[PDB]
Each structure stands twice: as C-alpha cells, then as structure tokens.
Ligand binder design. Structure first.
Ligand SMILES: [Zn+2]
Ligand SMILES: [Zn+2]
Lengths: 714, 766
C-alpha cells in the first residue's frame, strides 16, 4: 500500500514527501501543481536505533562529500565503495578491513537509512541557561514566576552554567556566587549596547565567569537571590504604563553570551510580563491613553513603533543565530507584549514562544515544565547548534527551506537558481531543536533519485553527534506513467507544504493575493488529476488519493493562519510560530480541527467539522491545536438537572468520557492548549460555531466545492 | 626703624584686650583681629562677622579715586561666636514674612526711622517711606524709639535671624533636610596606603557625631555611600535589609543614580546595615589592581542623587591621584612652565576641560556642595579638582605624600571637624547698601550668575566672603554709609531661614578721617583675594605692579594731603597703615604671585584657593606667621609666649621655636639647643639623636613636653585646618622649606627693600 509506504517512511526517516515518485523531466514537474517537497523532522523520535560510536565515512570528492549509506555500491574484494551521489570511488578506513557481504557495517544496512553518529570534538561544554526576568508585574505573577524558575533550576545538569539578568526601568546583570554581599551591574534601559562595549564595561576577557556559574556551585546562591527578588521599585503614575526596557535587556542578554561563550549551545530565556515601553524594541507608548497596536491600526499605518521595534529584534535575532544561541520568549500578560515585534528571536533561532494570561496560571507553569522534559536517560529533549546540510542527486536542486532555520549561504551544485523561502543555500543553522522540530524543504527537477539530510547537533550532556538520513524515491516517465506518479501523491503532506508556502507569502509584502494564488493552484490540481468530461461539473470525481485535499484548502483559506483580522497581532504571531514548527500530524490538526462525538449509541467516533454534527443528544470534543473545547448538546438539560444520581451510572460515564481523553491531551501536547467547557446556548459556544477575482467568500464547504467543480471542467 | 607687626599687635592688645567692645557707634573702629576681647553687639554687627577696610567711607567718587583706598567688607556670616558672648535671636514675623522696605527691599533693622505716630517708617538705605503693617505697629516715644526697641531684637541689634515664609523657598515648598554622601576612591593607591580601611573603620564612629539641633532627638540628615575606581559602585542600605546590596554603574559617559530608596537613609535606622558595609569595603577591594580613576562623574552622580531626593546635600569625596580614565573631565598631565613673562600663565590656574564650570553650576543650581579630601603623591591639577569644591562653597584638604604613621591624626582631625561643622545649605547672600554706593564685586568660595545674588551651595562657620563697593552717588556726612548683608539659606533641619547683618559706617569729605579709620588686616585681605582672583586673567607682573602702585598711591596721597609738614627724607605713614608695607610685601613674596623655582603648580593653586575663603583672622596669620620662642618658656606658669618677628635674625643656635601660619606648624631646633630641653620633650639625649622624619606627637616629658603641648593646643584652637607639624633640625636640613615662612627676609626683596621701594615711587609721584 502507498498508505503503508508513507507511514513506514515517516516513522523510519522522519520524512514525508508531497510525491513519493518523481517526474523525470523539469517540464512536466512544473505542470504538476504541487512541487517535489518534503517535511523533514531531523531529530525524529526513534528509540530503536543505537548511537553509533564512530565517525561517519565521507565521500572523498570535496563538492559532494556525502555520507556512506545503503545506496552506495560496495566491492568488498577491493575494499572500495562508490558514492551514489557523485559516483566517486572511495576507499575504506583501515578499521573497517574485516567488512564482508554478511558482516557489513551498520550505515550500509537499509534498516539504518536514518542513523546517528557520535563525534569526538574533544571539548565537552556545559549547557548555558540565561534567565532574563521582567519585574513589572503584580506580586502574584512574579512570585509564581520565581517558583517556575526555581523548578527549572532543579532540573538542569550540575555542570550547566546559569546566569540571571533582571530588568525594569533599569537593567541588572547580577554577579552570582558573590557571597557576603549582593552586587549587580546596572545600565540605562534606554541606550543600546554592543557586545564589545558590554565585554569592556563588565570587565571580561575576549572569547565559568562571575556572571555564568555552575548549577551545583551556585544552586544555593541563585535560589536565595531568586527568592529575594521583588518588583520594579520605581512607581507607576496613573494612566501610565510601567517603564519596561525589554529591547535593551535582551540586547544585553545576547551580548553577554556573545563575548563569553560564542558558538556553543545556550538558551536566553526571556520572561516578560508586558509590552516594552522604553526603547529600543519599544512596542508602545508609556501612556495608557493609547492602546497597543491592532491589526487595523498597523494596516492604517497607525502603529508608529512597529517598524522601528521589529528591526531592533530583527538585527538582534540574527546576532543570536550567528553566535549559535537560543532565544525563548515566555510572555504572559492580560494584553499584548509585542510578540509581533519579537517573533524573529524564537523564529530564527530554535526558541520557544509561550503566550499566557499570567504566570500564576496552571497553563503557564505546566507549559514551562514541559520545555525541560527529560528523555529515557535523564537528558533534556533539547539539541543545540545544528547544521542541516542536504545533498541531492544531480537531477534535483534545492529551492530552500521554511521553518526554524537561518541560511548559511553555502552555495553548491545542489542549490537551484530560483529559490524558495530560506533558499540560496544547501546548509541551514538551527540553534535550538527538539524531536518535533520540522522544516519544509523544497526541491526542483531539471534508477532512483536520492536525497541526504545530515544534521550535526549538540545533544544535551555535551555529546556532539551527527544525524544522517538518506532517502530514495523512484524516477518515472510522466509521458508513460502518470498513474504511478499520482499514486505516490501524499495529499496530507502536500497540504501542509502548500500552507507552509502560503503563510510564508503572508509575511512578505504580498497581500490577499495569497488566497488568489492559493486557489489558482487548487484549480490547477483538479484540472490535471481530476476525472471529468469537460464543462460537466457533476461528472467531476476525485481519486481517493486526492479527495481530501480540497477540503484541506477550504479550512486553510478560512483559518486564523491567514485571516488575522479577528485576532491580535501577537496571537497571529503565536499561531504561525508553532505551525511552521510542527510535524505533519499536529500541523493537520491546526488547519482542520478534529471533532469527536460521544453518545449513548456507540463509541467515540470522529465526525465532520460542520454544524450538522452538532446534535442535541451529542457531546462534541473539538481539537484545534491551541485549544480543547467540549460542547454539550441541548445532554445540557440532563446535566443541569443533576442526573450524581446512582440510577444513571451510565450518564455519569458519558459526561466523564470526553474529559478523560482531554486530560490525556493536556499532558502530552507541549504548547498546552486552552481548555473550554461550554454547551448549547453558552457564552463560549462562539468558539465552536466559528470553527465550523477570488474563488469564494466565507461560504460553506459545499458551495466551495461547487464553484471549484465548475471551474476545473472549463 | 618701623614699628614691627608684633609691636602693633601687642600694643593694641594692651590698650584694648580684656575690654568690652560695644558696637553702639556708627563709624566705630573695632580692635585688631589679633586682640582677644569681649564684644557686645549693641546695634551693630560684631567684627567677628564683618570687618571693613575703612570704617569711614569717602563721600564722593573723586575723593575715593584720590586716595585709591579699596572700600571692602569681609563678611564671615556664620562665624563662631564665643561662648561668653550673646547669641543670635530668631525673629518670626508671621505669615507675611519679614517686614521689608518696598523699594529698597532691605529687612527691618535698627536703621529704620519710625515717624508719624509709628504708622510709617522711613528706610535708612533708600530714604523711602513705608506703611508699618498693622500687626507690627507700635507707638513711639518722645525720641521716637519704639516701645519695644530693646525688646524686639530686629530693632536694637545688628545681627539676628529671620524665619522665612514659603515664598522664600524653591518651588514655594518647604525644603527637605540635607544629606551627606560619602564617596571613597578605591584605586590601588588608596588601598595600599591603608586609606580605605581607615575611612571606613573610622567612619563608623564618626557618623554618630552628625550635626543636629537641640530641638530634635535624631539628626534629620540622611547618609549615602559610594565607592569608585574608574567605575562607580553605588550601595543600597535600606533599613529592612540583613545585607547591603551593590549596584555598579559602568556608563561613565552618561552617569545616573541606580536607586532612590535605600540610598540616603537615616543612619540610626540603618546602623547595623551600614557598619556591615564599612566592615567589608576594605576586603572588597583589597586585591584591586586598578590605578586609573574618574572624577567629574563622581560629582555628577552625587549631585544627581540629591536632585532625585529633592534635597540639598554635601559630598564627602576622598580621592587619591590624577584622574586619567577616559571619561568627561579626563585630566592630562599638563605641568609645563609658561608662568613668568608669558601673558598666558593664567592657564595653569584654570581647569583643563570646560565641564568643571558647567558641573559646578549644576551643583549650585541644585544645592549640592562638594568637599574634597585629596591625597596626592604626584601632579594632580589642583586647579581642576578644587574648582568645583570652591564654587560650591566646600573646602579642600590636600595631604601631600600621605603616610599612615604620620598624617593619620592630621586627616582624622580634619574629617571630624568638617562633619561637625555648623553648616547651612542652598544659600544665597545679598548685600544691600544705603544710597550712594553699592556692592560691585565679590570674593570667596562662591558662584554668581547675576551681579547681586551670591549663591553658596553650602557655607560653614569658617567661610568668609569679601565684598567690594564702588560709588553710585554722593553720600551724606550726616547719615554716612549703611550695609545690610542677608543670607537666605536652609538649615540642617530643613527650615528656611534668613541671617541678617547690619553695619553703619561714617562718611566724611575730609581725607584725614578716611585714613584714620583704616584696618590693615582687612586691607591685606582684600588685596590678596583681588590679586589671587586676577591671577586667572592677567600676567603676574601686571598684578604685582598694580598692588605696588596702588600702595604707593595710597601713601603719597596721605603724605601730600594730611601729614603736618616734614622733611623730604622721611616716609610718613598713618597709624592705621603702620604695618601695611610689611604685610603687602609678604603678599608679593607668596608663592601664588612668585616664581617657578622649587614650587609645584599644585602648591600655588592650593594656596590660591585656601586664601580665597579666609576671614580676616585667618588671612592675617597666613601672611604673617607666629614665631614663638620655646627655650625661654616659663615653666608651669604659662600663657601664650610673646611673639617674635618673623626673621632668621631672631633665632638662636641655643633656642627652640614654634612657627605656625594656620596650615603648617614648624618646631625649629638650633645646633646648640640645651640637651636638658631635648630630653624633656623628645625623650632622646642629644640634638644629633633626633629624626626629622619622625614628626609624630611626643608625650613623655612632664615638665616641658606638657608646656609645649599646651601652647600648640591653644594656637590650634581658632584654626579650622589642623596643621601638619614639621620638625626642623637647624643646619643642612629641611630648613629650606621652613625659611620660606620667615616672611621679613629676602628668600623676592626683603622688608626694608620694599619700604625703600615704596619711598622711591612715593617721591616719583611728587
Ligand atoms: Zn560523492
Ligand atoms: Zn528703603
């Protein structure tokens, strides 16, 4: 089955291609509406694999330099192997000498198409966690945030280096381990600073410090300091906002590591409780009379701080990426914090972006601890400073990537001229990644084709490692075997890959022509792979490999990811940040939420995301990735009437049945979603009904297909 | 054969010491500053507060230009009134504030003639007529004297105090009590020479002695703390702390204060937290290897802290060496000889950067005063460092080549003194005169933006301002010349207050009365500050010529207009100016006006600033030292020994002497000194058994050592700076430094040289 080919390749190689059979010519590849592209998750969870304890054998050609893999022919008599990418003849290391057809090395076995090596760099470096704490928040939020920070401190390895920066009207870089007296370095929260300046002013050498010190040495001192921290002392006048210098404190945070520990793994965890009011990075004015930017404000050219503030964090984000450090942003506040301006920091590095109402909620405390999830061996599920290089067969050229990445602008034979997204390169830099981290690579065409994904990352516990993934797909003559190509179509994966593209166009200067282009392709795909007689819309039918794709486009073009004007600018940034970060499975849940139905007549079964599925005798469980909603059908009266009564044992289990699954999702999912319990006529029923020339308006799914049906046949 | 300075001082002491000087007469001439006498105010301001160069003004402008006698007053407005003399009263005139002339704006004083049944008073200064306000009215007697003339001190006394209503305050709001901020230089220099521990260790004890009035139980002055070594270390010492915090500021280009609360706190509340800080700071920087420091930012910060607290204050800076670190106020080593015959010498006595003037203006605008304890060992540019302490009205203490085993006691005594000093803050002095003349020039540790208001950030009991008058219109020999010095200021308890000084002076068209009413000690005071201030603008050969020619022009005018006819071979001097040639000749011998050989530019700049703040009692001594014979000293029956002329001719190889001028105190020992005395004072057998380098106080000999210790104590009594003792063996010793204080010797030209020099140009006028 092709559905088993997809499931077994996503599970084995962490890859999911839009097509598993490629056209043998650039021309016919262009006419296919969805390009040859794949969702690659470089560190996919795989407990079946051993970590191989030696260096990967590499192709001796300098321009190729690929890794030995099962697709490489082997002549055990001559002790040579031929690289399947450039065809170079390659000798073996003398330690392999005893290699034979039956006792071959691991990297050649097809079971190990994806494999991980353990490198021997020689320097084992500790992890660095730099806290950057906002102190302009009620004593509730700060006291809870101190507990979340003391908790994270307990989970870090003993050798890890911790560092504390706090800010408010001022910015303070604290000296740790300085006992008998508490001392800190202070800077005006209104003036920018470079890393060289900060290196001099703090009195540091070039390239443990007094500011970054091991956990085991300073556990007692930092927890005492953490517990003694109190709010920004400077008072806040009426009708005014606190002077919060978030842009400056981060510029000092990035610089503090840039001149002490460059080119190593580190997290700059910035916790903010409100918008930055004292520039640079200034999000909004200090007076409460003016409100924070709205999508209509920034549209009317009426948000005078956006362009200035973003360019600060923009340049700040590139500095951190070029240095090799992660920037997390934990932003809890009853209003916007400026995530739109700061999104580049967790987007270009591998940082997390966590939103919230307040740090004293079950939502935030739980979400923050999931960051520090440990694996089966007590090591964090984090990796740092990753180089993702991609080699392709000489008939394929890389367009570019989309997701948490920064181009290394390393040209080569695999780089295409016309590039897509973060293109013009064969290498990307991912500062912080997790098993879930998922990019979108885009390819171009000009007996199997092959692609290799090599990822060198710094695993926790300071062990340098290299993750190698080598995949192959079949060549096909599209003038003779369209059917063989259309059978390999991955409608699920092709849906995300296009949404991945359509949202990247939404950040660029391009406007609502995205919907216009998004439908131009959808129509093209129906005309090519659709069964129909011309101008007979009713005659048109879908293959079952394609039927779901138009419904995916429907829920995408009407989703939050492209219709921002019902959300805040920070919300839209929160959504897009996670979507271009997720594997296929969770990405699908985002676009088309999953709706389950529970009733006395049968087990829980997924149902259509339409108002027809809303029935009086039915409990619904909706799952968009960011919220979990439970809807009681007009069952609501059975609930309000209290049927606790021992006679109705079953009705007590029907109410409990969807909640029991909801608690399961409320521990597994990393960005722990908002929970909603509502019912028929409830105030919060709004969150369900809403989730239930240009091609069409906000029209139902049936009319969407009808207009699509009659266009594809003409 | 001229009357020596000693002969004049002891003469006036004989005919005026131990007598009550009652200031009840207009043109009354007070005794010399060198005559210990009791003083009763009786209507005129005491000569301890204000003295004049002439207590009888010339009535017209041309008459003053004839005599060329500078008309000036030396106002020491908070001078220490002795315990046995009547103190000032504080007058409260209700919500209205003190009664003032509507046009003259002079305060109600005994110079106000009440007329018309007491309903109106005529002003004594501008002869304007005012309506007596209803709450202050009283009938008048046959004379007119108000019934309460002797009851209300503002109507009977020359010196008293007023309560200042809110319209006399910044922002029209009751000011806040001041704050002391202690800022310690912690470069390797002050670490090594053990300075840091001492200040800190010694500081714990000293804070207790912070000034406070009798009416309050705890001092209202708050205390702040700072350390630095090219970087600023602020400190948080809030009361609710177990351990003091530190906040280090590195942006020296744009300094700021990182705190408001926990900085400037009440000592008695934060006592344990402060002692915990002072215990640590020695260890904290014990291993600092930093030499470069900053300076102007330190003043920049302590001033900013005071503005942030909306309060006046005083900065206690303890500094070590030349500030070189790249920052505002960065001073270079610029000691290059262009002093004589250059026309540009004025540069050396001026600060290098332009910021120290602006910085000083900012401190005075916010009531911030800087006092500086400098511990140099090399060039420092006293012209630059001390400019802000001078303009802010603060003091400057320089300890050349500090060594702990010697200069410790000297520094601690200067430091205890400056804390307990009776201080007023955010002060502005205004000197109103009667009709015919006005104050036109001011000299002192002051700053002035207009031409009438004399702004003093802080002012103590030792400060003194010299004020010059010029002629506006013709005065009246009937009414004479009036003076009213008013000092508005804020006290150490935060109250707004006016201290008033009234002085009447006589007028006459007869030049005889003008010369008959002159004071030399005050005339010398003016000429020094006039010449010292002119150092900044004109070559020194110009300044010395002006002083000489004005002296001869004063004496010739007396010769050609007053003296009964005498022979041409005689120089004729008035009794008021018997010693004026001696003293004037010593001013021209002083290193401020002398030449490069063997004297640092720092030493010239230090003395140039010291004199600028002096009262007449101090300016007299600094220019003519006191030379006391100790060998001939009576034993156990001792007042102060009689003084002896300042010359090597009055020393004996068998003698022991004590030279002091207010800042240094020398003990001189002849080669044939009686070994009996050397044993009873130094506890060593012979003369050759002493060490000059061991100038610490000796103590053992009961018979004399106590007699020598006793006379040193009474010399030091009235002296604000505690003097650096320096012991001199007679021959081939550090006597060269000593000989410069023998001011009647040659060294420039001697005394008899300048007399003969005066008499040539007194006849050149012909
Ligand atoms: Zn190759
Ligand atoms: Zn008047």
């Amino acid at each position: 089955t092709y559905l088993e080919f997809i499931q077994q390749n996503e599970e084995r190689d962490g890859v999911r291609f839009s097509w598993n059979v490629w056209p043998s010519s650039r021309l016919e590849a262009t006419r296919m509406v969805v390009p040859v592209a794949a969702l690659f998750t470089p560190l996919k969870e795989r407990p079946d694999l051993p970590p191989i304890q030696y260096e990967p054998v590499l192709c001796s050609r300098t321009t190729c330099r690929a890794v030995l893999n099962p697709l490489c022919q082997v002549d055990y008599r001559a002790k040579l192997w031929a690289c399947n990418f450039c065809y170079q003849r390659n000798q073996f290391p003398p330690s392999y000498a005893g290699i034979s057809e039956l006792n071959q090395p691991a990297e050649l076995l097809p079971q190990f198409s994806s494999i991980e090596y353990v490198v021997l760099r020689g320097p084992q470096m500790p992890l660095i966690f730099l806290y950057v704490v906002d102190t302009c928040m009620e004593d509730e939020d700060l006291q809870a945030l101190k507990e979340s920070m003391q908790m994270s401190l307990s989970l870090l390895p003993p050798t890890a280096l911790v560092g504390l920066i706090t800010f408010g009207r001022m910015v303070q870089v604290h000296e740790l381990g300085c006992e008998g007296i508490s001392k800190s370095y202070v800077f005006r929260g209104t003036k920018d600073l470079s890393a060289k300046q900060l290196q001099e002013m703090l009195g540091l050498s070039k390239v443990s410090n007094r500011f970054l010190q091991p956990v085991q040495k300073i556990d007692m001192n930092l927890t005492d300091l953490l517990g003694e921290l109190q709010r920004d002392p400077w008072p806040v006048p009426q009708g005014k906002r606190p002077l919060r210098s978030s842009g400056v404190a981060l510029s000092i945070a990035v610089g503090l590591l840039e001149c002490t520990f460059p080119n190593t793994g580190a997290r700059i965890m910035m916790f903010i409780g409100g918008p930055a009011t004292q520039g640079p990075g200034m999000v909004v004015g200090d007076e409460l009379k003016t409100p924070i930017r709205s999508w209509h404000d920034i549209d009317k050219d009426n948000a005078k701080y956006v362009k200035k503030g973003t360019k600060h964090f923009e340049a700040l984000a590139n500095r951190a990426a070029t240095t090799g450090h992660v920037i997390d942003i934990y932003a809890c506040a009853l209003d916007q914090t400026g995530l739109l301006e700061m999104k580049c920091c967790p987007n270009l590095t591998g940082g997390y972006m966590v939103m919230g109402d307040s740090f004293n909620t079950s939502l935030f405390k739980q979400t923050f601890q999931r960051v520090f999830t440990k694996d089966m061996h007590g090591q964090f599920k984090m990796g740092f400073g990753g180089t993702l290089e991609i080699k392709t067969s000489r008939e394929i050229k890389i367009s570019g990537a989309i997701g948490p990445c920064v181009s290394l602008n390393s040209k080569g034979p695999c780089v295409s001229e016309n590039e897509i997204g973060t293109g013009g390169t064969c290498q990307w830099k991912i500062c912080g990644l997790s098993p879930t981290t998922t990019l979108a690579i885009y390819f171009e065409v000009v007996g199997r084709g092959a692609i290799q994904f090599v990822t060198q990352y710094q695993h926790s516990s300071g062990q340098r490692r290299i993750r190698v993934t080598t995949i192959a797909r079949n060549w096909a003559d599209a003038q003779t075997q369209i059917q063989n190509i259309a059978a390999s179509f991955d409608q699920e994966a092709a849906a995300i890959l296009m949404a991945r593209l359509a949202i990247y166009r939404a950040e660029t200067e391009e406007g609502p022509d995205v919907l216009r282009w998004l439908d131009r392709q959808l129509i093209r795909l129906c005309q090519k792979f659709g069964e129909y007689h011309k101008d007979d819309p009713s005659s048109f039918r879908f293959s079952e490999t394609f039927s779901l794709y138009p419904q995916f486009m429907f829920h995408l073009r009407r989703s939050s990811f492209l219709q921002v004007f019902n959300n805040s600018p920070d919300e839209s940034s929160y959504y897009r940040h996670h979507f271009m970060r997720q594997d296929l499975t969770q990405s699908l849940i985002m676009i088309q939420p999953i709706l389950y139905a529970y009733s006395f007549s049968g087990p829980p079964e997924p149902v259509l995301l339409d108002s027809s599925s809303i029935l009086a005798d039915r409990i619904l469980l909706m799952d968009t990735f960011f919220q979990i909603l439970i809807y009681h059908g007009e069952i609501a009266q059975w609930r309000k009437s209290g049927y606790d009564m021992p006679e109705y044992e079953n009705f007590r289990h029907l109410l409990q049945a969807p909640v029991d699954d909801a608690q399961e999702i409320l521990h597994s999912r990393f960005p722990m979603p908002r929970y909603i319990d509502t019912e028929h006529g409830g105030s919060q029923a709004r969150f369900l009904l809403s989730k239930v020339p240009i091609l069409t308006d906000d029209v139902s799914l049936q009319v969407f297909m009808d207009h699509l049906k009659k266009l594809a046949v003409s | 054969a001229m009357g020596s300075p000693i002969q004049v001082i002891e003469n006036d002491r004989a005919s005026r010491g131990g007598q009550v000087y009652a200031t009840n007469t207009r043109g009354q001439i007070p005794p010399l500053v060198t005559t210990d006498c009791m003083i009763q105010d009786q209507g005129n301001a005491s000569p301890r507060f204000i003295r004049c160069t002439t207590y009888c003004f010339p009535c017209t402008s041309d008459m003053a230009k004839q005599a060329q006698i500078p008309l000036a007053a030396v106002i020491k407005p908070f001078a220490t009134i002795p315990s046995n003399e009547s103190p000032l009263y504080l007058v409260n005139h209700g919500e209205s504030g003190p009664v003032r002339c509507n046009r003259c704006k002079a305060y109600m004083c005994p110079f106000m003639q009440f007329i018309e049944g007491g309903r109106r008073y005529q002003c004594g200064f501008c002869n304007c007529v005012n309506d007596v306000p209803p709450f202050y009215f009283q009938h008048l007697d046959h004379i007119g004297r108000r019934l309460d003339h002797y009851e209300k001190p503002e109507l009977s006394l020359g010196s008293y105090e007023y309560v200042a209503t809110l319209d006399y305050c910044r922002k029209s709001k009751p000011p806040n009590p001041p704050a002391f901020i202690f800022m310690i230089d912690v470069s390797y220099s002050n670490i090594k020479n053990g300075l840091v521990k001492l200040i800190c260790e010694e500081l714990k004890t000293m804070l207790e002695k912070i000034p406070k009035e009798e009416q309050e139980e705890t001092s209202a002055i708050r205390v702040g703390f700072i350390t630095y070594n090219k970087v600023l270390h602020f400190f948080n010492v809030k009361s609710n702390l177990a351990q003091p915090q530190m906040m280090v500021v590195t942006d020296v280009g744009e300094v700021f204060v990182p705190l408001l609360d926990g900085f400037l706190v009440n000592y008695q509340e934060s006592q344990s937290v402060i002692h915990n800080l002072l215990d640590q700071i020695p260890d904290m920087f014990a291993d600092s290897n930093e030499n470069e420091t900053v300076f102007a930012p330190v003043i920049q910060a302590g001033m900013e802290a005071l503005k942030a607290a909306d309060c006046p204050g005083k900065l206690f800076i303890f500094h070590s060496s030349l500030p070189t670190a790249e920052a505002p106020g960065k001073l270079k080593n610029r000691d290059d000889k262009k002093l004589v015959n250059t026309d540009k010498e004025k540069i050396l006595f001026q600060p290098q950067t332009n910021v120290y003037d602006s910085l000083a203006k900012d401190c005075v605008a916010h009531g911030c005063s800087v006092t500086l304890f400098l511990f140099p060992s090399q060039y420092v540019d006293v012209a630059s460092l001390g400019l802000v302490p001078q303009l802010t009205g603060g003091t400057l203490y320089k300890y050349n080549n500090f060594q702990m085993h010697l200069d410790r006691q000297q520094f601690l005594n200067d430091l205890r003194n400056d804390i307990e000093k009776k201080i007023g803050f955010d002060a502005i002095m205004r000197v109103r005169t009667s009709t015919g003349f006005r104050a036109t020039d001011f000299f002192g540790g002051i700053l002035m933006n207009n031409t009438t208001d004399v702004e003093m950030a802080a002012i103590d009991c030792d400060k003194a301002v010299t004020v010059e008058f010029k002629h506006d219109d013709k005065l009246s020999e009937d009414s004479g010349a009036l003076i009213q010095c008013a000092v508005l200021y804020t006290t150490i308890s935060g109250q707004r207050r006016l201290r008033i000084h009234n002085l009447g002076l006589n007028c006459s068209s007869q030049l005889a009365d003008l010369y008959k009413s002159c004071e030399t000690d005050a005339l010398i005071n003016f000429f020094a500050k006039s010449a010292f201030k002119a150092v900044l603008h004109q070559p020194l050969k110009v300044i010395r010529e002006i002083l000489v020619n004005q002296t001869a022009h004063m004496l010739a005018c007396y010769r050609k207009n007053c003296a009964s006819p005498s022979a041409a071979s005689q120089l004729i001097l008035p009794d008021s100016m018997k010693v004026l040639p001696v003293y004037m000749n010593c001013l021209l011998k002083n290193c401020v006006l002398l030449s490069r050989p063997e004297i640092s530019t720092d030493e010239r700049a230090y003395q140039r600033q010291l004199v600028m703040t002096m009262g007449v009692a101090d300016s007299q001594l600094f220019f003519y030292p006191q030379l006391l014979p100790i060998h001939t000293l009576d034993v156990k029956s001792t007042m102060l020994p009689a003084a002896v002329r300042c010359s090597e001719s009055r020393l004996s190889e068998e003698g022991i002497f004590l030279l002091a001028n207010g800042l240094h105190m020398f003990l001189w020992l002849g080669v044939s000194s009686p070994p009996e005395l050397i044993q009873g004072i130094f506890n060593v057998p012979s003369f050759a058994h002493i060490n000059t380098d061991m100038t610490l106080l000796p103590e053992v000999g009961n018979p004399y050592s106590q007699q020598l210790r006793m006379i040193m104590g009474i010399i030091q009594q009235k002296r604000p700076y505690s003097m650096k003792l320096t012991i001199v063996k007679q021959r081939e010793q550090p006597e060269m430094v000593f000989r410069q204080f023998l001011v009647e010797d040659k060294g420039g030209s001697s005394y008899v040289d300048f007399l003969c020099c005066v008499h040539k140009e007194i006849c050149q006028l012909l």
